[PDB]
Amino acid sequence: SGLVKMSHPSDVEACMVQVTCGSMTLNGLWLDNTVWCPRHVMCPADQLSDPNYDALLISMTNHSFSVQKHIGAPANLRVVGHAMQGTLLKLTVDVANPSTPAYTFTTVKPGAAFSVLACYNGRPTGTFTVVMRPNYTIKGSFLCGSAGSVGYTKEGSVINFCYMHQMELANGTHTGSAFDGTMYGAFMDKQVHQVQLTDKYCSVNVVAWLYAAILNGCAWFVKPNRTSVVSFNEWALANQFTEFVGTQSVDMLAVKTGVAIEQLLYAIQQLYTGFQGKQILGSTMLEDEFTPEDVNMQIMGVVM
Amino acid sequence: SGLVKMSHPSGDVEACMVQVTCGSMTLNGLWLDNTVWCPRHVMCPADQLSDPNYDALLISMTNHSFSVQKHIGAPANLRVVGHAMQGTLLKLTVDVANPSTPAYTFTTVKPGAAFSVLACYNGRPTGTFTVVMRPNYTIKGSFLCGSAGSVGYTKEGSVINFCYMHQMELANGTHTGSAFDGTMYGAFMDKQVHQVQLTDKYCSVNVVAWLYAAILNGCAWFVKPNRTSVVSFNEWALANQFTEFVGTQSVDMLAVKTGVAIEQLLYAIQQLYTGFQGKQILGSTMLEDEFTPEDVNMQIMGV
């Protein structure tokens, strides 16, 4: 038993490289004959407020990009093509990464969790799990040099790459791109004022976490009282919570505990006004980064 | 910026994990060079776990009672050619040296220190997370039946220090395991009987680190001019379920960087313990004590 922040084992390490363009360096992801990296690797430090990426791109040649693998079997790769796709570069290299995993590209939705491999100078340093916030940021831990760090989920041994790190928006607040090149939240990859929409508690994840708590012998907050999903969602609009949408993963926790979703919706309304000195799974505030899927896996060993 | 629970990249350790089977039990082991380490309870039938005789069970085994398989990476079946029991572990000798063995040491970790865990089932890595060895010699993890043999480790440059092999659950969300010398953290027995755990304590030095991280992340509302000396904080600590504060160079770098003295944060702790008064620190409304000074330095500075 127990519930902790858990990340995937980090297949992904053997794909990380360093990409250098003139005076700038960051991380890239080497999949088959493609190295993906952020397009701001092209931008001099003094132009990050107003880059003209179209012009920067035209000024580059294949020779402008230096790609190196430091980790595992080392290597220097030759760039034989370059293109810009949204906020990313797609560099073609002349060696296919022999450690390329089975993979897909996905775009995650608010409330969904993924693992991040934080890297600097093409060297992985750490891993942690985040949730895509309702305002299309993540709350991570990243310093200068981390751009090109990637975020992923798994399904079996398929890695689903969903995030490539770009920038910090505010203290402990981060964003990046999907591998189609779009930035989450349509933030702009430059140093300009943007400000995020307001963050919200992810209701379905708070429910998951309360189920985890019940399953771990912590059920003091459960009462007979119920609040409907409809009425909860009305309240949620006024109190900085997302709209609750149930799933089969949530229904499995309800079946296993015999505690209805609507009892936890009521519990949430009450706990938001205070925990009255008590704690839930070590916390005295609501936790909304454990998904129903995560709870089902950690507590039951159950995937589907 | 930002401070999150962070673990080591797990690749080096993934390449040493194997499945170990003895009879109808199965769990994980760690394959370094020509040795596979695993928990000794893989010898014990599920129904005998309440009161096992390990010395008897051992004599009853041959090399061939153990099956070892590597699933991930280049898969292989490894033949066991030797076995010994070392405290709560078995040391099995196998006939192929793990070619992905990292440079490594075995060291026992002390309370308050952090390490990364690679949770595995059937010799397959499934997740990784970071824990702190609690003051009562337990860890607060996430482990289900089948996770025994999962390993805990830190890294120092190219060297993995293996410090923990998962054994058992003591209570909901409360776990222990062995150092690689075979001793169980907290001297708990590897048997299914209720065992009392000493009371846990807040790791003072890690609380201080976390408050420094808060300040470095723009959250300093709790800092006041007021100060409490180390000697005096330590007296108070004994009566309030906090560990003894022992300063380090790591903590001193944070003090230098923030211009906030350790003693101001010892005072703050005394006040925060009584309540946060509707406020939060890096998202929490309770004290956090599993971020070490080394963790904070690394995450916030290059250091």
Coordinates of C-alpha atoms in Angstrom, one line a residue:
Chain A
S1 CA 0.0 0.0 0.0
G2 CA 1.0 3.7 0.1
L3 CA 0.6 6.5 -2.5
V4 CA 3.5 8.6 -3.6
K5 CA 4.5 10.7 -6.6
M6 CA 5.8 8.1 -9.1
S7 CA 7.4 8.5 -12.4
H8 CA 8.1 6.0 -15.2
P9 CA 11.5 4.2 -15.4
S10 CA 13.4 6.6 -17.6
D11 CA 14.4 4.1 -22.6
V12 CA 14.2 7.9 -22.8
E13 CA 17.7 8.5 -21.4
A14 CA 19.2 6.7 -24.4
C15 CA 17.4 9.2 -26.8
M16 CA 18.8 12.4 -25.3
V17 CA 21.4 14.4 -27.0
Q18 CA 22.9 17.9 -26.9
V19 CA 22.2 20.4 -29.6
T20 CA 24.3 23.5 -30.2
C21 CA 23.7 26.4 -32.5
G22 CA 26.4 29.1 -32.4
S23 CA 26.5 30.3 -28.9
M24 CA 23.4 28.5 -27.6
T25 CA 23.0 24.9 -26.4
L26 CA 20.1 22.8 -25.1
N27 CA 18.8 19.2 -25.3
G28 CA 17.3 17.3 -28.2
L29 CA 15.4 14.0 -28.6
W30 CA 17.0 11.6 -31.1
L31 CA 14.4 9.2 -32.6
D32 CA 15.4 7.3 -35.7
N33 CA 16.9 9.9 -38.1
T34 CA 15.3 12.9 -36.4
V35 CA 16.6 15.1 -33.6
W36 CA 13.8 17.3 -32.2
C37 CA 14.7 20.4 -30.2
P38 CA 13.4 23.8 -29.4
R39 CA 13.7 26.4 -32.2
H40 CA 15.0 29.1 -29.7
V41 CA 18.4 27.3 -29.8
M42 CA 18.7 29.5 -33.0
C43 CA 18.1 32.8 -31.0
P44 CA 20.9 34.9 -29.6
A45 CA 20.4 35.8 -25.9
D46 CA 19.8 39.5 -26.7
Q47 CA 16.9 38.7 -29.2
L48 CA 14.8 36.4 -27.0
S49 CA 12.2 39.2 -26.6
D50 CA 11.6 39.6 -30.3
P51 CA 13.0 36.8 -32.3
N52 CA 12.3 36.5 -36.0
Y53 CA 12.3 32.7 -36.3
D54 CA 11.6 32.7 -40.0
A55 CA 14.6 34.8 -40.7
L56 CA 16.8 32.9 -38.2
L57 CA 15.9 29.7 -39.9
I58 CA 16.8 31.0 -43.4
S59 CA 20.2 32.1 -42.1
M60 CA 21.1 28.6 -40.9
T61 CA 22.7 25.8 -42.8
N62 CA 22.9 22.1 -41.8
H63 CA 26.4 23.0 -40.6
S64 CA 25.0 25.5 -38.1
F65 CA 23.8 22.6 -35.9
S66 CA 26.1 20.5 -33.8
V67 CA 24.5 17.4 -32.3
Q68 CA 26.2 15.2 -29.7
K69 CA 25.4 12.1 -27.6
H70 CA 27.3 12.1 -24.3
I71 CA 25.5 9.4 -22.5
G72 CA 25.6 5.6 -23.4
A73 CA 27.5 4.8 -26.6
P74 CA 28.8 8.2 -27.3
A75 CA 28.5 9.9 -30.8
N76 CA 28.7 13.0 -32.9
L77 CA 25.9 13.1 -35.4
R78 CA 25.9 14.9 -38.7
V79 CA 22.9 17.1 -39.4
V80 CA 21.8 16.5 -43.1
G81 CA 18.6 18.5 -43.0
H82 CA 16.7 21.0 -40.9
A83 CA 13.1 22.2 -40.7
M84 CA 10.9 24.2 -38.4
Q85 CA 7.6 22.8 -37.2
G86 CA 5.8 25.3 -35.0
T87 CA 8.1 26.0 -32.0
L88 CA 10.4 23.0 -32.6
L89 CA 13.2 22.2 -35.0
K90 CA 13.3 18.9 -36.7
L91 CA 16.9 18.1 -37.6
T92 CA 17.6 15.1 -39.8
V93 CA 20.7 13.2 -38.9
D94 CA 22.6 10.6 -40.8
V95 CA 22.5 7.8 -38.2
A96 CA 19.3 6.3 -36.9
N97 CA 19.3 6.1 -33.2
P98 CA 19.8 2.3 -32.6
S99 CA 18.2 2.8 -29.1
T100 CA 15.0 4.2 -30.4
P101 CA 12.0 2.9 -28.5
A102 CA 8.6 1.9 -29.8
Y103 CA 6.9 5.4 -29.6
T104 CA 4.1 7.7 -30.4
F105 CA 3.3 11.3 -30.2
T106 CA 0.3 12.5 -28.1
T107 CA -1.0 15.8 -26.8
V108 CA -2.2 15.5 -23.1
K109 CA -5.2 17.3 -21.7
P110 CA -5.5 19.2 -18.5
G111 CA -5.6 16.8 -15.5
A112 CA -3.5 14.2 -17.2
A113 CA -0.1 13.1 -15.7
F114 CA 3.2 12.5 -17.4
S115 CA 6.8 11.9 -16.5
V116 CA 9.5 14.4 -17.2
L117 CA 13.2 13.6 -17.7
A118 CA 15.1 16.8 -16.8
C119 CA 18.3 17.2 -18.7
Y120 CA 21.1 19.7 -19.1
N121 CA 23.7 19.6 -21.9
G122 CA 22.2 16.4 -23.1
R123 CA 22.8 14.7 -19.8
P124 CA 19.7 13.5 -17.8
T125 CA 19.8 14.7 -14.2
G126 CA 16.4 13.9 -12.7
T127 CA 12.9 12.7 -13.2
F128 CA 9.5 13.7 -11.8
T129 CA 5.8 13.6 -12.6
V130 CA 3.6 16.5 -13.4
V131 CA 0.0 17.1 -14.4
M132 CA -0.9 19.4 -17.3
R133 CA -2.7 22.1 -15.3
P134 CA -6.1 23.5 -16.3
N135 CA -4.3 26.7 -17.4
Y136 CA -1.9 24.7 -19.7
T137 CA 1.1 25.0 -17.5
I138 CA 3.0 22.4 -15.5
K139 CA 4.5 22.8 -12.1
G140 CA 8.0 21.5 -12.4
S141 CA 11.5 22.1 -11.4
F142 CA 13.6 23.4 -14.3
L143 CA 16.6 25.8 -14.6
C144 CA 18.3 27.5 -17.6
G145 CA 19.6 24.8 -20.0
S146 CA 16.6 22.5 -19.4
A147 CA 14.8 23.3 -22.6
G148 CA 14.5 20.2 -24.8
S149 CA 13.9 18.0 -21.7
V150 CA 11.0 15.7 -22.6
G151 CA 7.8 14.5 -21.0
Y152 CA 6.1 11.1 -21.7
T153 CA 3.6 8.5 -20.7
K154 CA 3.7 4.8 -21.4
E155 CA 1.4 2.0 -22.6
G156 CA 3.2 -1.3 -22.4
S157 CA 6.6 -0.7 -23.8
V158 CA 5.3 2.1 -26.1
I159 CA 6.6 5.5 -25.0
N160 CA 4.2 8.3 -25.8
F161 CA 6.1 11.6 -26.1
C162 CA 3.8 14.4 -25.1
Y163 CA 6.0 17.4 -24.0
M164 CA 9.2 19.1 -24.9
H165 CA 10.2 21.7 -22.4
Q166 CA 10.6 25.4 -23.6
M167 CA 10.3 28.0 -20.8
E168 CA 9.4 29.2 -17.4
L169 CA 6.4 31.6 -17.2
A170 CA 6.4 32.4 -13.4
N171 CA 7.9 31.0 -10.4
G172 CA 7.6 27.1 -10.4
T173 CA 5.5 27.4 -13.5
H174 CA 6.5 26.0 -16.9
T175 CA 5.4 25.3 -20.3
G176 CA 6.5 23.6 -23.6
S177 CA 5.4 22.0 -26.8
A178 CA 3.8 18.9 -28.1
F179 CA 5.7 17.1 -30.9
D180 CA 3.4 18.6 -33.5
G181 CA 5.2 21.8 -32.6
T182 CA 2.3 23.6 -30.8
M183 CA 2.9 25.2 -27.4
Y184 CA 0.5 24.0 -24.7
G185 CA -1.8 26.9 -23.8
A186 CA -0.7 28.7 -27.1
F187 CA 2.0 30.4 -25.1
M188 CA 4.6 32.1 -27.3
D189 CA 8.3 30.9 -27.1
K190 CA 9.7 34.3 -26.4
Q191 CA 10.4 36.6 -23.5
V192 CA 7.2 38.7 -23.6
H193 CA 4.4 39.2 -21.2
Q194 CA 1.7 36.5 -21.4
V195 CA 0.2 35.6 -18.0
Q196 CA -1.6 32.3 -17.6
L197 CA -5.3 31.8 -17.1
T198 CA -6.1 31.1 -13.5
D199 CA -5.2 27.6 -12.3
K200 CA -7.9 25.3 -10.9
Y201 CA -8.1 22.2 -8.7
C202 CA -8.5 19.1 -10.9
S203 CA -11.7 17.7 -9.4
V204 CA -11.5 14.2 -10.8
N205 CA -8.0 13.9 -9.4
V206 CA -9.0 15.1 -5.9
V207 CA -11.7 12.4 -6.0
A208 CA -9.1 9.8 -7.0
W209 CA -6.9 10.9 -4.1
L210 CA -9.8 10.6 -1.6
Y211 CA -10.4 7.1 -2.9
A212 CA -6.7 6.3 -2.4
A213 CA -7.0 7.6 1.1
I214 CA -10.0 5.3 1.8
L215 CA -8.2 2.4 0.4
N216 CA -5.2 3.2 2.7
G217 CA -7.4 3.2 5.9
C218 CA -8.0 7.0 6.0
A219 CA -11.7 7.5 5.7
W220 CA -12.6 10.1 8.4
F221 CA -13.9 12.5 5.8
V222 CA -16.5 10.2 4.4
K223 CA -20.1 10.9 5.5
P224 CA -23.4 9.7 4.1
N225 CA -24.1 13.0 2.6
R226 CA -23.9 13.4 -1.2
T227 CA -23.6 16.2 -3.7
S228 CA -24.7 15.5 -7.3
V229 CA -22.2 15.9 -10.1
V230 CA -24.5 18.6 -11.6
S231 CA -24.6 20.6 -8.3
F232 CA -20.9 20.0 -7.7
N233 CA -20.1 21.4 -11.1
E234 CA -22.1 24.5 -10.4
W235 CA -20.2 25.0 -7.2
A236 CA -16.9 24.2 -9.0
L237 CA -17.5 27.2 -11.4
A238 CA -17.5 29.5 -8.4
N239 CA -14.7 28.0 -6.4
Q240 CA -11.8 27.4 -8.7
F241 CA -12.4 23.7 -9.4
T242 CA -12.6 22.0 -12.8
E243 CA -15.8 20.4 -14.0
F244 CA -16.0 16.8 -12.8
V245 CA -16.3 14.3 -15.6
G246 CA -16.5 10.6 -14.4
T247 CA -14.6 7.8 -16.0
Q248 CA -14.4 4.1 -15.8
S249 CA -11.2 4.4 -13.9
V250 CA -13.0 6.4 -11.2
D251 CA -16.0 4.0 -11.3
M252 CA -13.6 1.1 -10.4
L253 CA -12.5 2.9 -7.2
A254 CA -16.2 3.6 -6.3
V255 CA -17.0 -0.1 -6.8
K256 CA -14.0 -1.3 -4.8
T257 CA -14.6 1.0 -1.8
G258 CA -18.4 1.0 -1.9
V259 CA -18.1 4.9 -1.5
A260 CA -20.1 6.8 -4.2
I261 CA -18.5 9.6 -6.2
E262 CA -21.2 11.9 -4.9
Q263 CA -20.1 11.3 -1.3
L264 CA -16.6 12.5 -2.2
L265 CA -18.0 15.5 -4.1
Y266 CA -19.7 16.5 -0.8
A267 CA -16.4 15.8 1.1
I268 CA -14.5 18.1 -1.3
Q269 CA -16.9 21.0 -0.7
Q270 CA -16.4 20.6 3.1
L271 CA -12.6 20.0 3.0
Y272 CA -12.1 23.1 0.8
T273 CA -13.5 25.1 3.8
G274 CA -10.9 23.4 6.0
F275 CA -9.5 20.1 7.3
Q276 CA -10.2 21.1 10.9
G277 CA -6.8 20.0 12.1
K278 CA -6.8 16.6 10.5
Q279 CA -4.8 15.1 7.7
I280 CA -5.4 12.9 4.6
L281 CA -2.5 10.7 3.5
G282 CA 0.0 13.1 5.1
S283 CA -1.5 16.3 3.7
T284 CA -3.6 19.0 5.2
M285 CA -4.6 20.4 1.8
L286 CA -6.3 18.9 -1.2
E287 CA -4.1 17.0 -3.6
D288 CA -5.0 17.0 -7.3
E289 CA -2.0 15.5 -9.1
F290 CA -2.9 11.8 -8.5
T291 CA -5.0 10.6 -11.4
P292 CA -7.7 7.9 -11.2
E293 CA -5.3 5.8 -13.4
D294 CA -2.4 6.4 -11.1
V295 CA -4.4 5.5 -8.0
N296 CA -5.8 2.3 -9.6
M297 CA -2.2 1.3 -10.5
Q298 CA -0.5 2.1 -7.2
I299 CA -3.2 0.7 -5.0
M300 CA -4.6 -2.3 -7.0
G301 CA -1.9 -3.0 -9.6
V302 CA -4.8 -2.4 -12.1
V303 CA -4.3 -0.7 -15.6
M304 CA -7.7 -0.9 -17.4
Chain B
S1 CA 12.8 27.6 -10.4
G2 CA 10.4 25.3 -8.6
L3 CA 10.9 22.4 -6.1
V4 CA 9.4 19.0 -6.8
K5 CA 10.1 15.5 -5.5
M6 CA 12.8 14.3 -7.9
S7 CA 14.4 10.9 -8.5
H8 CA 17.6 9.8 -10.3
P9 CA 17.3 8.8 -14.0
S10 CA 16.8 5.1 -13.5
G11 CA 18.4 3.5 -16.6
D12 CA 21.7 2.3 -14.9
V13 CA 19.7 0.4 -12.2
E14 CA 17.0 -0.9 -14.6
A15 CA 19.8 -2.8 -16.4
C16 CA 20.6 -4.7 -13.2
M17 CA 17.1 -5.9 -12.3
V18 CA 16.1 -9.5 -12.6
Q19 CA 13.3 -11.9 -11.5
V20 CA 14.2 -14.6 -8.9
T21 CA 12.0 -17.7 -8.4
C22 CA 12.3 -20.4 -5.7
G23 CA 9.5 -22.9 -5.8
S24 CA 6.3 -21.1 -6.2
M25 CA 7.6 -17.7 -4.8
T26 CA 8.9 -15.0 -7.0
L27 CA 10.3 -11.6 -6.4
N28 CA 13.0 -9.2 -7.7
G29 CA 16.7 -9.3 -7.4
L30 CA 19.7 -7.1 -8.2
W31 CA 22.4 -8.5 -10.6
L32 CA 25.8 -7.0 -10.1
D33 CA 28.8 -8.7 -11.8
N34 CA 28.5 -12.5 -10.9
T35 CA 26.1 -11.9 -7.9
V36 CA 22.3 -11.7 -7.6
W37 CA 21.0 -10.2 -4.4
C38 CA 17.4 -10.9 -3.3
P39 CA 15.3 -11.1 -0.2
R40 CA 15.7 -14.4 1.8
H41 CA 11.9 -14.8 2.0
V42 CA 11.7 -16.0 -1.6
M43 CA 12.6 -19.4 0.1
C44 CA 9.5 -19.3 2.3
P45 CA 6.1 -20.5 1.3
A46 CA 3.3 -17.8 1.6
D47 CA 1.6 -19.8 4.3
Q48 CA 4.9 -20.1 6.5
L49 CA 5.7 -16.4 6.4
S50 CA 4.2 -15.9 9.8
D51 CA 7.0 -18.0 11.5
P52 CA 9.7 -19.1 9.1
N53 CA 12.9 -21.0 9.9
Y54 CA 15.4 -19.4 7.6
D55 CA 18.4 -21.5 8.7
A56 CA 16.3 -24.7 8.1
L57 CA 15.0 -23.4 4.8
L58 CA 18.5 -22.5 3.6
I59 CA 20.0 -26.0 4.3
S60 CA 17.0 -27.3 2.3
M61 CA 18.0 -25.4 -0.8
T62 CA 20.4 -26.3 -3.6
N63 CA 21.8 -23.9 -6.2
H64 CA 19.1 -25.3 -8.5
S65 CA 16.2 -24.3 -6.2
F66 CA 16.7 -20.8 -7.6
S67 CA 15.7 -19.6 -11.1
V68 CA 17.0 -16.2 -12.2
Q69 CA 15.7 -14.4 -15.3
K70 CA 16.5 -11.0 -16.9
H71 CA 13.5 -9.8 -18.9
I72 CA 14.3 -6.3 -20.1
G73 CA 17.4 -5.3 -22.1
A74 CA 19.1 -8.3 -23.8
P75 CA 17.1 -11.1 -22.2
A76 CA 18.9 -14.1 -20.6
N77 CA 18.4 -17.0 -18.2
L78 CA 21.2 -17.1 -15.7
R79 CA 22.3 -20.3 -14.0
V80 CA 22.8 -20.2 -10.3
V81 CA 26.1 -21.7 -9.2
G82 CA 26.2 -20.7 -5.6
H83 CA 24.1 -19.5 -2.7
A84 CA 24.6 -18.0 0.8
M85 CA 22.4 -16.2 3.3
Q86 CA 23.7 -12.9 4.6
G87 CA 21.3 -11.5 7.3
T88 CA 18.0 -11.0 5.5
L89 CA 19.3 -11.4 2.0
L90 CA 20.5 -14.2 -0.2
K91 CA 23.6 -13.7 -2.2
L92 CA 23.3 -15.9 -5.2
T93 CA 26.3 -16.5 -7.6
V94 CA 25.5 -16.8 -11.2
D95 CA 27.6 -17.8 -14.2
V96 CA 27.5 -14.6 -16.3
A97 CA 28.9 -11.2 -15.1
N98 CA 26.3 -8.5 -15.7
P99 CA 27.8 -6.6 -18.5
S100 CA 25.7 -3.4 -17.6
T101 CA 27.0 -3.4 -14.0
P102 CA 27.6 0.2 -12.9
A103 CA 30.5 1.4 -10.7
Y104 CA 28.9 0.9 -7.3
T105 CA 29.2 0.8 -3.5
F106 CA 27.0 -0.4 -0.7
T107 CA 26.4 2.1 2.1
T108 CA 23.8 2.2 4.8
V109 CA 21.8 5.4 4.8
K110 CA 21.1 7.5 7.9
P111 CA 17.8 8.9 9.0
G112 CA 16.9 12.1 7.0
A113 CA 18.9 11.1 3.9
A114 CA 17.0 10.7 0.6
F115 CA 17.4 8.0 -2.0
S116 CA 15.6 6.9 -5.2
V117 CA 13.6 3.7 -5.4
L118 CA 13.1 1.6 -8.5
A119 CA 9.9 -0.3 -7.9
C120 CA 9.8 -3.6 -9.8
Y121 CA 7.4 -6.6 -10.2
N122 CA 8.4 -9.9 -11.7
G123 CA 11.9 -8.5 -12.5
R124 CA 10.3 -5.6 -14.5
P125 CA 10.8 -2.0 -13.5
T126 CA 7.5 -0.2 -13.2
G127 CA 8.1 3.1 -11.3
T128 CA 10.5 5.3 -9.5
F129 CA 10.1 7.6 -6.6
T130 CA 12.2 9.2 -3.9
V131 CA 12.0 8.6 -0.2
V132 CA 13.8 9.6 3.0
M133 CA 14.9 7.1 5.6
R134 CA 12.6 8.1 8.5
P135 CA 13.9 8.8 12.0
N136 CA 12.1 5.5 13.0
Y137 CA 14.0 3.5 10.4
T138 CA 11.0 3.0 8.1
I139 CA 10.3 4.6 4.6
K140 CA 7.0 5.9 3.3
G141 CA 6.7 4.3 -0.1
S142 CA 4.3 2.8 -2.5
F143 CA 4.8 -1.0 -2.7
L144 CA 2.5 -3.9 -3.4
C145 CA 2.9 -7.7 -3.0
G146 CA 5.7 -8.7 -5.4
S147 CA 7.8 -5.6 -4.9
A148 CA 10.3 -7.2 -2.5
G149 CA 13.8 -7.0 -4.1
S150 CA 13.0 -3.5 -5.5
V151 CA 16.1 -1.3 -4.8
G152 CA 17.0 2.1 -3.4
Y153 CA 20.1 4.0 -4.3
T154 CA 21.8 7.4 -4.6
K155 CA 24.5 8.4 -7.1
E156 CA 27.8 10.3 -6.8
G157 CA 29.2 11.1 -10.1
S158 CA 29.6 7.7 -11.9
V159 CA 29.1 5.7 -8.7
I160 CA 25.7 4.2 -7.8
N161 CA 25.4 3.7 -4.0
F162 CA 23.0 0.9 -3.3
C163 CA 21.4 1.4 0.0
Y164 CA 18.1 -0.4 0.2
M165 CA 16.5 -3.6 -0.9
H166 CA 12.8 -3.6 -0.3
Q167 CA 11.5 -6.4 2.1
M168 CA 8.1 -5.7 3.7
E169 CA 5.2 -3.6 4.7
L170 CA 4.8 -2.8 8.4
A171 CA 1.5 -0.8 8.3
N172 CA -0.4 1.2 5.7
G173 CA 2.1 3.2 3.6
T174 CA 4.9 2.2 5.9
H175 CA 7.8 0.0 4.7
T176 CA 11.2 -1.3 5.4
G177 CA 14.0 -3.3 3.8
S178 CA 17.6 -4.3 4.1
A179 CA 20.9 -2.6 3.6
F180 CA 23.2 -4.7 1.3
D181 CA 25.1 -5.9 4.3
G182 CA 21.9 -7.8 5.1
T183 CA 20.7 -5.9 8.1
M184 CA 17.1 -4.7 8.1
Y185 CA 16.6 -1.0 8.7
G186 CA 15.1 -0.6 12.1
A187 CA 16.0 -4.2 13.0
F188 CA 12.5 -5.3 12.0
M189 CA 12.2 -9.1 11.4
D190 CA 11.3 -10.5 8.0
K191 CA 8.3 -12.3 9.2
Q192 CA 4.6 -11.7 9.1
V193 CA 3.9 -10.7 12.8
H194 CA 2.9 -7.3 14.0
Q195 CA 5.9 -5.3 15.1
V196 CA 5.9 -2.0 17.0
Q197 CA 7.5 1.0 15.2
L198 CA 9.2 3.8 17.2
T199 CA 7.4 7.1 16.7
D200 CA 8.4 9.1 13.6
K201 CA 9.9 12.6 13.9
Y202 CA 10.2 15.7 11.7
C203 CA 13.7 15.8 10.1
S204 CA 14.6 19.3 11.2
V205 CA 17.5 19.9 8.8
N206 CA 15.3 19.0 5.8
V207 CA 12.5 21.4 7.1
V208 CA 15.1 24.1 7.2
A209 CA 16.2 23.2 3.6
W210 CA 12.6 23.4 2.4
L211 CA 12.1 26.8 4.0
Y212 CA 15.3 28.0 2.2
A213 CA 13.8 26.7 -1.0
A214 CA 10.6 28.6 -0.3
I215 CA 12.6 31.9 0.2
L216 CA 14.5 31.2 -3.0
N217 CA 11.2 30.7 -4.7
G218 CA 9.6 34.0 -3.6
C219 CA 7.8 32.7 -0.5
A220 CA 9.3 34.3 2.6
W221 CA 6.2 35.5 4.6
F222 CA 7.3 33.3 7.5
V223 CA 10.7 34.9 7.9
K224 CA 11.0 37.2 10.9
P225 CA 13.9 38.9 12.6
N226 CA 13.5 36.6 15.5
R227 CA 16.0 33.8 16.1
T228 CA 16.3 30.6 18.1
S229 CA 19.7 29.2 18.8
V230 CA 20.7 25.7 17.6
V231 CA 21.2 24.5 21.3
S232 CA 17.9 25.9 22.3
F233 CA 16.0 24.6 19.2
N234 CA 17.4 21.2 20.0
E235 CA 16.1 21.3 23.5
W236 CA 12.7 22.2 22.2
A237 CA 13.0 19.5 19.5
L238 CA 13.3 16.7 22.1
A239 CA 9.8 17.6 23.5
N240 CA 8.1 18.3 20.2
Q241 CA 8.9 15.2 18.0
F242 CA 11.7 16.9 15.8
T243 CA 15.1 15.4 15.3
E244 CA 18.3 17.1 16.5
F245 CA 19.3 19.8 14.0
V246 CA 22.9 19.3 12.8
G247 CA 24.2 22.0 10.4
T248 CA 26.1 21.2 7.2
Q249 CA 28.0 23.0 4.5
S250 CA 25.0 22.4 2.3
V251 CA 22.7 24.3 4.7
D252 CA 25.3 27.1 5.0
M253 CA 25.3 27.7 1.2
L254 CA 21.6 28.3 1.4
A255 CA 22.0 30.7 4.4
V256 CA 24.6 32.6 2.4
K257 CA 22.5 32.7 -0.7
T258 CA 19.4 34.0 1.0
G259 CA 21.0 36.2 3.7
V260 CA 18.6 34.4 6.1
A261 CA 20.3 32.8 9.2
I262 CA 19.7 29.2 10.2
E263 CA 18.5 30.6 13.5
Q264 CA 15.8 32.7 12.0
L265 CA 14.3 29.5 10.4
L266 CA 14.6 27.5 13.6
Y267 CA 12.4 30.1 15.2
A268 CA 10.0 30.0 12.2
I269 CA 9.7 26.2 12.5
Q270 CA 8.7 26.6 16.2
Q271 CA 6.0 29.0 15.1
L272 CA 4.9 27.0 12.0
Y273 CA 4.6 23.9 14.0
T274 CA 1.8 25.5 16.1
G275 CA 0.1 26.5 12.8
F276 CA 0.3 28.1 9.3
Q277 CA -2.6 30.4 10.0
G278 CA -4.4 30.0 6.7
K279 CA -1.2 30.4 4.7
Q280 CA 0.9 28.1 2.5
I281 CA 4.5 27.4 1.7
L282 CA 5.4 26.0 -1.8
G283 CA 1.9 24.7 -2.0
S284 CA 1.8 22.9 1.4
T285 CA -0.1 23.8 4.6
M286 CA 2.1 21.5 6.7
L287 CA 5.8 21.2 7.1
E288 CA 7.7 19.2 4.5
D289 CA 10.8 17.2 5.7
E290 CA 11.7 15.0 2.7
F291 CA 13.6 17.7 0.7
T292 CA 17.3 17.5 1.8
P293 CA 19.7 20.5 1.8
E294 CA 21.6 18.7 -1.1
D295 CA 18.3 18.3 -3.0
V296 CA 17.4 22.0 -2.6
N297 CA 20.9 23.2 -3.6
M298 CA 20.8 21.0 -6.7
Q299 CA 17.3 21.9 -7.8
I300 CA 17.5 25.6 -7.2
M301 CA 21.2 26.4 -8.0
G302 CA 23.5 24.4 -10.1
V303 CA 24.9 23.1 -6.8

